[PDB]
Amino acid sequence: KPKLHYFNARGLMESTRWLLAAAGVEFEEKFIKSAEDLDKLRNDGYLMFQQVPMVEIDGMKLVQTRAILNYIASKYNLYGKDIKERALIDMYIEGIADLGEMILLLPVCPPEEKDAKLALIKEKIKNRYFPAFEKVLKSHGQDYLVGNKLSRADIHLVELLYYVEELDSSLISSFPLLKALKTRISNLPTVKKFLQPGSPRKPPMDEKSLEEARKIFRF
Amino acid sequence: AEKPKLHYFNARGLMESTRWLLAAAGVEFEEKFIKSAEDLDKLRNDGYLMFQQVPMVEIDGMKLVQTRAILNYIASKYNLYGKDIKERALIDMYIEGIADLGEMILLLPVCPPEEKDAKLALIKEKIKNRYFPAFEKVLKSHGQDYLVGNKLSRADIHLVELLYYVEELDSSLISSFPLLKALKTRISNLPTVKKFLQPGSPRKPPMDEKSLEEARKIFRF
Ligand SMILES: CCCCCCSC[C@H](NC(=O)CC[C@H]([NH3+])C(=O)O)C(=O)NCC(=O)O
Ligand SMILES: CCCCCCSC[C@H](NC(=O)CC[C@H]([NH3+])C(=O)O)C(=O)NCC(=O)O
């Protein structure tokens, strides 16, 4: 089974949790709880750049979120049929990641910058990102983003939709095809299982969990 | 049928690694330089930019935005992305490390003036203590001339590009890393990369204050 080394939070690992779950792959987590737990990983030679996420998979120890994701996507045939399809996938999921990163640093930003950053994100979802993905879907009228077939792009997008919902349930309301995709993907047996109570899916980061991160990652 | 066309402003920015990679692959390309916010607006209105941003590259009859999408496609097309999934993961791991350090360096002139000095010091420490030791360790592990699969890949190209940037930053930083210095020399001597380093190539200079003002106007920040 793949083993995920991270702290007990969404952070940089949650999209890996989603992708693995969506692929039907059972994994294990080893939760880092302290600065010393992290330092033990570092000491033991487990972390190429002294950082997590790190995933032990197929007998090697992989750091770098995108390295982890690309490998899993390829392995479980969720990265398209060919390099042209991979190009569409990569374009879409990099837009999703840009938005995702913004949503992630929300509580980590200075408190005096939080309001402006939230307003900015909302505007980008409204005017930039949702129109772009709605456009792709309305272009080919198909149930999936690429190749008329489940890909990581669908998984990464729907994950994002859940985060946007948490922010403001109205943001999606003028994008019927995004709403429909959320529903379809969420009803896929693997994803439906991951969405159920008690799965490895992680909650939004609260103030205590942020406090933990500051201790573990020294910031 | 048509050479790739790179849409960006006349500056390194987010396009420089693509310029390096295409040149290293031996691929002639064209550039269409954005001069103003109006030029970027025209791209947006023409429907050429999926997220209303550049870098954008027209290659093989399609428009690609997102630096990583562009690079991934190029690397795969020209067999600079490893021979299998495991080699790809090594490559990805290395180049994402490189990306992290490169962004730190890129965003240095856009730090508020009072944060500028402490940030630099932190960059030097991470170069010395974190990044250069990792890559020196890889080179030492196998003793081969290339990072991955004993064959040229995008990892060698991305890393050597960064070595040149670090040299601009502080020529002393590479000093205790002999294998890194050796990689830089060998890669610089490959016919394609040699041509790219010569005067007059599409390789772009370090970004100066006035270029950065051009970016503030074009990209409205
Ligand atoms: C907003 C919630 C906070 C999320 C937790 C912080 S991520 C922890 C941090 N890891 C990274 O920044 C890895 C970035 C890398 N580019 C990747 O994508 O994997 C780390 O190990 N830091 C230790 C170090 O760099 O020294
Ligand atoms: C240190 C300053 C260096 C100048 C670099 C400017 S990059 C310009 C900017 N592009 C992006 O942020 C693209 C990000 C994207 N994630 C990618 O990798 O391609 C843009 O088009 N912005 C316009 C917009 O987003 O509206």
From Swiss-Prot, chain A:
- Modified sites of kind N6-succinyllysine: K1
Q: Give me any GO biological process, just one.
A: glutathione metabolic process
**Residues engaged in binding glutathione:** Y6, R42, Q51, V52, Q64, T65
| Keywords annotated in UniProt | Acetylation, Cytoplasm, Isomerase, Lipid metabolism, Oxidoreductase, Peroxidase, Transferase
Which locations, inside or outside the cell, does it occupy?
Cytoplasm
What does the UniProt record note about how this protein's activity is regulated? The isomerase activity is inhibited by S-methylglutathione (GSMe).
Q: How does it assemble?
A: Homodimer or heterodimer of GSTA1 and GSTA2.
Name under which the protein is recorded:
Glutathione S-transferase A1
Q: What is the lineage of its organism?
A: Eukaryota, Metazoa, Chordata, Craniata, Vertebrata
Gene name? GSTA1
